Amino acid sequence: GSVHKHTGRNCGRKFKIGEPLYRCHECGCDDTCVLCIHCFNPKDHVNHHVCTDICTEFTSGICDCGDEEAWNSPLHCKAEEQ
């Protein structure tokens, strides 16, 4: 794959139509806190209740990876992996 790292800042990627918005019950500050496909690291959420929404005209947003106020636990952004 090829994916942009956002080291030292938040992701903030606007979701594209058809894309999943990842939600983690355990990690998210609340249920508006979401991760994009570049960022969501399944290893962070092995023991967690995770769900996806799909981006449409009415369900939109931006990825919260790297916004420390959105997350209870440290995230390991998938983009950072080698």
How many Å apart are CA 16 and CA 32, to the nearest integer? 17
Q: How far is the CB of 11 from Zn ion (least distance, A)?
A: 3
Of the pair 25, 56, the CB lying nearest Zn ion is at: 25
Using CB under 5 A as the binding criterion, the count of chain residues that bind Zn ion stands at 13
CA-wise closest residue to 22 among 36, 6, 12, 5: 36
For tokens 């947003």, name the residue: 61
Tell whether 51 is in a known binding site. no
Neighbouring-strand partners of residue 20: 54
Q: How far is the CB of 13 from Zn ion (least distance, A)?
A: 5
Interacting residues with Zn ion between 15 and 74 (CB under 5 A): 24, 26-27, 36, 38-39, 45, 48, 63, 65
* Token representation of residue 27: 């990690």
